Design an enzyme around this catalytic site. Sequence first.
Site, PDB file in Angstrom:
ATOM      1  N   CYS A 274       0.817  -1.236   0.000  1.00 17.05           N
ATOM      2  CA  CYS A 274       0.000   0.000   0.000  1.00 17.05           C
ATOM      3  C   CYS A 274       0.846   1.279   0.000  1.00 17.05           C
ATOM      4  O   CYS A 274       1.888   1.292   0.615  1.00 17.05           O
ATOM      5  CB  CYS A 274      -0.951   0.036   1.186  1.00 17.05           C
TER       6      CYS A 274
ATOM      7  N   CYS B 202      -5.152   0.619   9.982  1.00 18.58           N
ATOM      8  CA  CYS B 202      -5.220  -0.419   8.920  1.00 18.58           C
ATOM      9  C   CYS B 202      -5.265  -1.825   9.543  1.00 18.58           C
ATOM     10  O   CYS B 202      -4.324  -2.209  10.297  1.00 18.58           O
ATOM     11  CB  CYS B 202      -4.069  -0.289   7.949  1.00 18.58           C
TER      12      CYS B 202
ATOM     13  N   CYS C 209      -2.684   4.653   6.874  1.00 17.47           N
ATOM     14  CA  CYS C 209      -3.868   4.720   7.757  1.00 17.47           C
ATOM     15  C   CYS C 209      -3.532   4.111   9.116  1.00 17.47           C
ATOM     16  O   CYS C 209      -3.134   2.938   9.173  1.00 17.47           O
ATOM     17  CB  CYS C 209      -5.054   3.972   7.178  1.00 17.47           C
TER      18      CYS C 209
END
Length: 284
Positions: free
Chosen positions: A15, A22, A19
């Site tokens: 990714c 996550c 975040c």
Amino acid sequence: GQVPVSVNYHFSRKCNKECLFCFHTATTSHVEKPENAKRGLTLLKQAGMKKINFAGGEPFLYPKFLGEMIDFCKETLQLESVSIVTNGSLVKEQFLQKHGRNIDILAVSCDSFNEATNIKIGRGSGDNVQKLYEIGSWCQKYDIKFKLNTVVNKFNHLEDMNDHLNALQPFRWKCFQVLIIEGENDSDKTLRNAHSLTISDDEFDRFCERHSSQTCLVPEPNRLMAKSYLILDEYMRFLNCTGGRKDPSKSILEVGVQQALQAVFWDEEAFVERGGIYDWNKSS
Ligand SMILES: Nc1ccn([C@@H]2O[C@H](COP(=O)(O)OP(=O)(O)OP(=O)(O)O)[C@@H](O)[C@H]2O)c(=O)n1
Ligand SMILES: C[S@@+](CC[C@H](N)C(=O)[O-])C[C@H]1O[C@@H](n2cnc3c(N)ncnc32)[C@H](O)[C@@H]1O
Ligand code: SF4
Ligand SMILES: [Mg+2]
Ligand SMILES: [Mg+2]
């Protein structure tokens, strides 16, 4: 055994974003070669799969793979529904022109309409909202159903998003209570630690009540989200969430779908209750 009607293929864990919550972290970079992925998706179709959701990881890091699998699933396997879930940052209009005929649903993850919140979460550097409106326009141009995914967490649970939802008008708005998974986001030692971002059941209910006018809202408190998904990892192993873990089966490419699913928990009542069966293509 259970019929895997709607499957999430987390085909890579890589990714481009950070975040803080996550729950499907970048612990590997393995991706199946296309011949193996196509074999796996064929075995799932034969077991009764009607809908495939391409996830990860960020799927648009792999546009060649993703394009090949979307075209195969719609043209060869004739699935009722092909969906993608994306952070939206790497979606290009050219992809939707080339493959859009084979894409039933595109879900964009956007947790806030306030850019200071998106930055604090770790999902962007301030352009998420503008990109989300542009993807919404592209979905209207290329006849793709437009879906919005929101993680309701400590940073956004007080936000009123009605004015933006009234402009964007997604057909489906997933609101996930932030979920802790052992080995992903639960520890000092994992790639993430989401414990500071969790909210109470009442805080999550107040978020949904704040948005009671949005008929597209699909709420998913932890009790509905945790064990109601069929989750295939980057080795096409089913992940069992019975423990609050993500414990892998053997690969469907080694033992077949029936043997891999046999000792996986999948809560079909939770799956139906959250709205897992819906009008998931344009003819519906
Ligand atoms: N314990 C869990 C439960 C869910 N998920 C993942 O959370 C995502 C939820 O995205 P969503 O848009 O809800 O998935 P779909 O299956 O496309 O949803 P629907 O068919 O209901 O539109 C999925 O990738 C799912 O595999 C997860 O990683 N771990
Ligand atoms: C792990 S992401 C993979 C796809 C893509 N990278 C994205 O963010 O859309 C799949 C979905 O799960 C959501 N999600 C991630 N971590 C979560 C958590 N801890 N609890 C609930 N939802 C979560 C994401 O925001 C997204 O909508
Ligand atoms: S939730 Fe965020 S960090 Fe996790 S895979 Fe999606 S964009 Fe990446
Ligand atoms: Mg389409
Ligand atoms: Mg209300």
